[PDB]
PDB file of C-alpha atoms and ligand atoms in Angstrom:
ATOM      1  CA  UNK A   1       5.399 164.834 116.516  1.00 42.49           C
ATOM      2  CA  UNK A   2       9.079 163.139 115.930  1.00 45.27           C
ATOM      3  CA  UNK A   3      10.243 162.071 119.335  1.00 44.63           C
ATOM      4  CA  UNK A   4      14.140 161.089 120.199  1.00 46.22           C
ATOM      5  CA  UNK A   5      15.632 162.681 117.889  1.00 48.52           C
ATOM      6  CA  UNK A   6      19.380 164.071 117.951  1.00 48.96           C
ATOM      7  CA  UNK A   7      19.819 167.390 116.524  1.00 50.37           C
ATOM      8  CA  UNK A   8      22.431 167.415 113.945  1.00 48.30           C
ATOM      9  CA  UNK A   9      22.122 170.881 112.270  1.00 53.16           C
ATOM     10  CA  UNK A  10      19.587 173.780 112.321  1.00 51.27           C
ATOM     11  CA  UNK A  11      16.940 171.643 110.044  1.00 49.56           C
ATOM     12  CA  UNK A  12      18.850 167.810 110.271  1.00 50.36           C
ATOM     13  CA  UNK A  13      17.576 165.801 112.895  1.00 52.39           C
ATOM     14  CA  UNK A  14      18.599 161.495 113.335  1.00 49.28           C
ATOM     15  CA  UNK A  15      17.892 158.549 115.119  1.00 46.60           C
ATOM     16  CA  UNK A  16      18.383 154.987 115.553  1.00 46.23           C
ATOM     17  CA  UNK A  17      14.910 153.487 114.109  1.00 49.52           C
ATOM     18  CA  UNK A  18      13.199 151.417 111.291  1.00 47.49           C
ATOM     19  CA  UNK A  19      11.744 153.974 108.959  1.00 46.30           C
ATOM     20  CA  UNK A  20       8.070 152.219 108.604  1.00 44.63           C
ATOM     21  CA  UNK A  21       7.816 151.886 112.446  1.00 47.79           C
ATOM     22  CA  UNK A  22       8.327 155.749 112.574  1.00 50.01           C
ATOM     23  CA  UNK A  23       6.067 156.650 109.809  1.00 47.11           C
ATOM     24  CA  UNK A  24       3.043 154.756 111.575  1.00 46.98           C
ATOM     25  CA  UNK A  25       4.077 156.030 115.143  1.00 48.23           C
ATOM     26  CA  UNK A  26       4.211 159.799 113.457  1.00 47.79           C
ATOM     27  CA  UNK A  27       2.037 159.569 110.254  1.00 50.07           C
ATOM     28  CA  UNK A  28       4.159 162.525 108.930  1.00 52.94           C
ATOM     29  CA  UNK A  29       3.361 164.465 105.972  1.00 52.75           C
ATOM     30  CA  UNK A  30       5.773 163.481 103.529  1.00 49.87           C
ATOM     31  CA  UNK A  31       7.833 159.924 104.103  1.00 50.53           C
ATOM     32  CA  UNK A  32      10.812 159.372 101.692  1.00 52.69           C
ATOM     33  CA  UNK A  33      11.561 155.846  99.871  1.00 51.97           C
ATOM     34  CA  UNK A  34      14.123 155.235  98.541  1.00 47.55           C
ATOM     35  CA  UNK A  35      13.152 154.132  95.018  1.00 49.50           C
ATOM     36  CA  UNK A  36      14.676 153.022  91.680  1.00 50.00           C
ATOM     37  CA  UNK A  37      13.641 154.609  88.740  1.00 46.95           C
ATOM     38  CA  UNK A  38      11.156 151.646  87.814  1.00 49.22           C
ATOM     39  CA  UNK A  39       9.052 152.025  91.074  1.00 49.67           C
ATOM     40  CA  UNK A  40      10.050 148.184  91.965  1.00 50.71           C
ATOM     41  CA  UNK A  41      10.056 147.869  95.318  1.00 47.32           C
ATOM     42  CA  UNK A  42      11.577 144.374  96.121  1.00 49.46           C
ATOM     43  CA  UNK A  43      13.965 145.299  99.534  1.00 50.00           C
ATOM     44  CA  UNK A  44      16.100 147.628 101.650  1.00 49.21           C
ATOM     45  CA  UNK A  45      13.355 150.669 102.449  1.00 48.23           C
ATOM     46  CA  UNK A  46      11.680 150.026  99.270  1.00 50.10           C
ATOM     47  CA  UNK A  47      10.306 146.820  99.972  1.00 51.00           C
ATOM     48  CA  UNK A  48       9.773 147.490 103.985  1.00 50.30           C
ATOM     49  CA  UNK A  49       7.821 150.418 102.906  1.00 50.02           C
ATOM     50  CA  UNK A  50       5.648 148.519 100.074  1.00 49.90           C
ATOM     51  CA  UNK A  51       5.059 145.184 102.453  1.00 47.64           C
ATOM     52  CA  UNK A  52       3.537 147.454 105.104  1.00 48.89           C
ATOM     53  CA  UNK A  53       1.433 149.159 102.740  1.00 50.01           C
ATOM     54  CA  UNK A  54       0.220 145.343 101.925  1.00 51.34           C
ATOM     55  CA  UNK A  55       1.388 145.965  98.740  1.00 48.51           C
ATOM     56  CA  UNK A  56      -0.457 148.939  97.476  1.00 49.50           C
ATOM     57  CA  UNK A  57       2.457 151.146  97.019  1.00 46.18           C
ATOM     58  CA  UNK A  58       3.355 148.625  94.476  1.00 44.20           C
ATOM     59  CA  UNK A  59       0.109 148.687  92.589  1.00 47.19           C
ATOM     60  CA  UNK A  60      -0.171 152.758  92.254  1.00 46.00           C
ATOM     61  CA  UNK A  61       3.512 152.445  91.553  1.00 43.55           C
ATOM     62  CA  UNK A  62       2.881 150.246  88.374  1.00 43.65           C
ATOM     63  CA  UNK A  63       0.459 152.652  87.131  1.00 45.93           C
ATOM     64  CA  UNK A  64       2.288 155.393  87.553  1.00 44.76           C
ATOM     65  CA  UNK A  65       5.525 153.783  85.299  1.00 44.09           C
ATOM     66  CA  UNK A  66       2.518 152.268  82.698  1.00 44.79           C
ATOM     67  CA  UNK A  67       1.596 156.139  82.790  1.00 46.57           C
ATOM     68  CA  UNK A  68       4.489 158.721  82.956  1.00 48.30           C
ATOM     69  CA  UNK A  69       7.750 155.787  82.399  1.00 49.40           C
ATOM     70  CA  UNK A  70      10.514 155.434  84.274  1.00 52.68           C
ATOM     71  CA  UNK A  71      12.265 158.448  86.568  1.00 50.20           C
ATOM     72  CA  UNK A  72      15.210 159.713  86.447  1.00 52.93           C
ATOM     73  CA  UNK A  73      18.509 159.114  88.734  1.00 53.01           C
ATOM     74  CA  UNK A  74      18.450 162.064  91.030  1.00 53.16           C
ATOM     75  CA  UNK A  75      14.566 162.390  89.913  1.00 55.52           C
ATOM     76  CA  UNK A  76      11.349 161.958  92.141  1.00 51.77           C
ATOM     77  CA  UNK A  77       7.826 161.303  92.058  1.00 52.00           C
ATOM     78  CA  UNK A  78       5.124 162.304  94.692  1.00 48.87           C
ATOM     79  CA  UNK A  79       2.418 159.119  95.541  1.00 46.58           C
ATOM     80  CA  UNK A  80      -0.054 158.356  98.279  1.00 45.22           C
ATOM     81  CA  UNK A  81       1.354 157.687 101.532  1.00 46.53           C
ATOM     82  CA  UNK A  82      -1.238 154.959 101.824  1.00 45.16           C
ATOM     83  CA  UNK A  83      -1.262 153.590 105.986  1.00 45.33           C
ATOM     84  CA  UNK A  84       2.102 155.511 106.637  1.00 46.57           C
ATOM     85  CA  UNK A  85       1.990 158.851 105.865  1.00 45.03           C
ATOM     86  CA  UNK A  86      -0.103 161.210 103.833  1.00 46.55           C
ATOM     87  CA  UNK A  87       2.653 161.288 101.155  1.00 43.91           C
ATOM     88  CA  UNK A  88       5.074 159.555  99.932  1.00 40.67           C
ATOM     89  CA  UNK A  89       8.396 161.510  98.323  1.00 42.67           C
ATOM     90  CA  UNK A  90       9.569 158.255  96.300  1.00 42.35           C
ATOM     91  CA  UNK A  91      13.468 159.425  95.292  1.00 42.04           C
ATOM     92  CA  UNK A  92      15.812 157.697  93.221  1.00 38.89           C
ATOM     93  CA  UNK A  93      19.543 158.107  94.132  1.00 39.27           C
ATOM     94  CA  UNK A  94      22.354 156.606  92.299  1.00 36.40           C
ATOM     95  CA  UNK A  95      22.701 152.721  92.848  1.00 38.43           C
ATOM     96  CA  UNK A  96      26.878 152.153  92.989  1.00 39.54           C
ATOM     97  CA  UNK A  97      26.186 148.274  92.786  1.00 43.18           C
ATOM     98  CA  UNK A  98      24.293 149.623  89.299  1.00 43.72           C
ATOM     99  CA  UNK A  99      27.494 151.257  88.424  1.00 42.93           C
ATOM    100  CA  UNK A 100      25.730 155.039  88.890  1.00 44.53           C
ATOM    101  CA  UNK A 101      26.963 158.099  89.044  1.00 47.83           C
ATOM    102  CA  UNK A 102      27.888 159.090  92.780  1.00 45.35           C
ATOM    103  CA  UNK A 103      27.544 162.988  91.914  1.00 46.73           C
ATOM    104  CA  UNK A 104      23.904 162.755  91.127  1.00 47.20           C
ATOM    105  CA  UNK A 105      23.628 162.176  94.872  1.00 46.91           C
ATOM    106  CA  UNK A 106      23.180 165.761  95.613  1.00 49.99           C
ATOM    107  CA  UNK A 107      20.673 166.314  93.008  1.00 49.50           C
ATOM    108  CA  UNK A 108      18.423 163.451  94.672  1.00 48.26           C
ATOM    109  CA  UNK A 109      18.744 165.109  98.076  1.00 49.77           C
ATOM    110  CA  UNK A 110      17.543 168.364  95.995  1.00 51.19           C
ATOM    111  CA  UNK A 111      14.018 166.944  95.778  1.00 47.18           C
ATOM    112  CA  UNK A 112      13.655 167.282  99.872  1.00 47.24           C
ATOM    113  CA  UNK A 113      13.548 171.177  99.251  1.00 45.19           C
ATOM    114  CA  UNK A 114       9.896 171.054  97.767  1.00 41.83           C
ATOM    115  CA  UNK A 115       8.791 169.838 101.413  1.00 42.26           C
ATOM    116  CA  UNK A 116       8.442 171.593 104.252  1.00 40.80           C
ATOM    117  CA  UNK A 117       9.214 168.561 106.574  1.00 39.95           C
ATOM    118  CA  UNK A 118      10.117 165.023 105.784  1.00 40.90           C
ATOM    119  CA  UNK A 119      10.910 161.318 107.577  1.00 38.50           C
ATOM    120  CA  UNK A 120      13.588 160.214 104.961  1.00 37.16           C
ATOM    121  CA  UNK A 121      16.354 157.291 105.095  1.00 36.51           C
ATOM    122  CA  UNK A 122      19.589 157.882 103.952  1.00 36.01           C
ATOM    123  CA  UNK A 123      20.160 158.511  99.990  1.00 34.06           C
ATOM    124  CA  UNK A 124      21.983 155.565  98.034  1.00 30.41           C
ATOM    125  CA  UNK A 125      23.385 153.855 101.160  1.00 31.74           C
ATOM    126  CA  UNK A 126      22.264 150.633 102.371  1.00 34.04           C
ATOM    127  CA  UNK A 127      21.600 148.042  99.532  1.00 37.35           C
ATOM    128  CA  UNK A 128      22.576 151.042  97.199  1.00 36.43           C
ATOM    129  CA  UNK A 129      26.382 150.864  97.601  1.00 35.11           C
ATOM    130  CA  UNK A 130      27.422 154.516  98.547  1.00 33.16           C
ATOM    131  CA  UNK A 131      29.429 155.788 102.066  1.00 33.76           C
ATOM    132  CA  UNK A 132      26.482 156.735 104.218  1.00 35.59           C
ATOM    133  CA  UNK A 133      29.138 159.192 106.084  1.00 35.17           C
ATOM    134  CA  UNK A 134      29.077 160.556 102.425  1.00 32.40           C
ATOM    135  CA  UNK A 135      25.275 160.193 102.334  1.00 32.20           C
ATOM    136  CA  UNK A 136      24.861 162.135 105.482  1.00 30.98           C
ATOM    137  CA  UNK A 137      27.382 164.953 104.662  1.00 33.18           C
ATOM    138  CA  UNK A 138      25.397 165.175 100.851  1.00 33.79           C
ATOM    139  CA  UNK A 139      21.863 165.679 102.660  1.00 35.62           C
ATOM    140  CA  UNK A 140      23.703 168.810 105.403  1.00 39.48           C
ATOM    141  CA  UNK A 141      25.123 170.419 102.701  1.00 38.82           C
ATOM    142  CA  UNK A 142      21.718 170.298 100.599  1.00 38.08           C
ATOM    143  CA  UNK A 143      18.762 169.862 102.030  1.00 36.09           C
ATOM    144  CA  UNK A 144      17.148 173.217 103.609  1.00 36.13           C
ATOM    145  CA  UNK A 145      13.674 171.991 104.899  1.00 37.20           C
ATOM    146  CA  UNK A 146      12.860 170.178 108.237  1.00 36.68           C
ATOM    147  CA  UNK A 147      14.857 166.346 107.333  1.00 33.62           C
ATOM    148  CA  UNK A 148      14.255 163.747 110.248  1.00 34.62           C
ATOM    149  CA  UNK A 149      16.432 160.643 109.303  1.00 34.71           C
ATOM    150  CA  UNK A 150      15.499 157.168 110.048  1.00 36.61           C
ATOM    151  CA  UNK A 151      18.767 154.805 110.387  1.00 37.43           C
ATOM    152  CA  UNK A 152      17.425 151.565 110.914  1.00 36.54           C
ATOM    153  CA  UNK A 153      21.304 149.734 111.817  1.00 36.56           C
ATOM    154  CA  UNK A 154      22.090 150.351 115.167  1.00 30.79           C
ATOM    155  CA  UNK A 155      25.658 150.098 114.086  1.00 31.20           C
ATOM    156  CA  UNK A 156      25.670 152.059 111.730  1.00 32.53           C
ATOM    157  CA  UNK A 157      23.534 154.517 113.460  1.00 32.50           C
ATOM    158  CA  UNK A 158      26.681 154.821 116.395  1.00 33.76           C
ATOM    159  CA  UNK A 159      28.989 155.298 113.243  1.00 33.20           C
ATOM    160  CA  UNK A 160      27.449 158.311 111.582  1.00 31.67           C
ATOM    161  CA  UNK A 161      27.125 160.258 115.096  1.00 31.08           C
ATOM    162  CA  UNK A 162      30.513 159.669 116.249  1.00 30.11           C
ATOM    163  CA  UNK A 163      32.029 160.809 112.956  1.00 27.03           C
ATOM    164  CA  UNK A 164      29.580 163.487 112.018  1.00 25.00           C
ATOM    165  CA  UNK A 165      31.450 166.998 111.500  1.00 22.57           C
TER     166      UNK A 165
HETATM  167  C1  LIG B 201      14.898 148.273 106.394  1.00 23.73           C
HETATM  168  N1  LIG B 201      14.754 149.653 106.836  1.00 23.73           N
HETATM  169  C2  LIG B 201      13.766 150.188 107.599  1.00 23.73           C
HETATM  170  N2  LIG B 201      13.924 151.459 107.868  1.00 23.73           N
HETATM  171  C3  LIG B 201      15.115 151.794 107.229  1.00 23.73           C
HETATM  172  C4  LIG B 201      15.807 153.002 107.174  1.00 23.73           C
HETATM  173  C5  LIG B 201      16.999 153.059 106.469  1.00 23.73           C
HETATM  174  C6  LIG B 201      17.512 151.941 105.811  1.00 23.73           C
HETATM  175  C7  LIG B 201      18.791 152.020 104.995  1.00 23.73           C
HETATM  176  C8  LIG B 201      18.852 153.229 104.037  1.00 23.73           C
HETATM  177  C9  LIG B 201      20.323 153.472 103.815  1.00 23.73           C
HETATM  178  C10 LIG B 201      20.894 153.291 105.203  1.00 23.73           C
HETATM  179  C11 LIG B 201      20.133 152.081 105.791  1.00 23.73           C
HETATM  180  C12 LIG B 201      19.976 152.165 107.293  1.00 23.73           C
HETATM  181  O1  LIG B 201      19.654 153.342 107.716  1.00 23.73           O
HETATM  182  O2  LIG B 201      20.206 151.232 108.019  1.00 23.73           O
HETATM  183  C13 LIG B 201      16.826 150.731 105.869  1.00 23.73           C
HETATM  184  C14 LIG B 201      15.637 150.679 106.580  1.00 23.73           C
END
């Protein structure tokens, strides 16, 4: 099971590690990427996740956009897991660098709820261009099911504790 983790709330657990070195160590149920609505997975968790998967999240991605189209902002789709995980929970928060809408945040964090425990990174920071403080407080105040989050920066790992309320 997760190992290391600090306990942040009743069901909000964190800690300092790279997200695909977790999901092999743990093979979870249910590991979160954090997607864009075209399934492209070219960097930040997106493209860590697909290059360990030696690519094969990519190819069932590209079927499933040739199939169903694009997602939604806030929206998710549920895909194989492949090596990491028997799942994978691929959710699209808002991209601020993409000029998106910041509110839909709490709407992405929504799609957690439909899973009973999940290894997720943190919603539309990173490469996405939101306040991961924000990030953090979004998934607290929404998410109800079993959340362990993976921050891969140390730095900003040591950030998010010290100012978490
Ligand atoms: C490259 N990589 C691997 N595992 C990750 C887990 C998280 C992240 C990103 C998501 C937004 C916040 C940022 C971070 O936690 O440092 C990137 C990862």
């Amino acid at each position: 099971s997760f190992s290391g983790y600090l306990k942040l709330t009743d069901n909000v657990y964190i800690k300092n590690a790279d997200i695909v070195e977790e999901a092999k160590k743990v093979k979870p149920t249910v590991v979160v990427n954090a997607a864009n609505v075209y399934l492209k997975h070219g960097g930040g968790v997106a493209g860590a996740l697909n290059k360990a998967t030696n690519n094969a999240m990519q190819v069932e991605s590209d079927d499933y956009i040739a199939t169903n189209g694009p997602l939604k902002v806030g929206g998710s789709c549920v895909l194989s897991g492949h090596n990491l995980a028997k799942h994978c929970l691929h959710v699209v928060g808002p991209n601020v660098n993409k000029g998106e809408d910041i509110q839909l945040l709490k709407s992405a964090y929504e799609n957690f709820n439909q899973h009973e425990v999940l290894l997720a990174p943190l919603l539309s920071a990173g490469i996405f261009g939101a306040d991961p403080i924000h990030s953090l407080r979004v998934c607290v105040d929404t998410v109800r099911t079993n959340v362990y989050l993976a921050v891969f920066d140390k730095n900003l790992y040591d950030k998010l504790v010290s100012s978490f309320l």
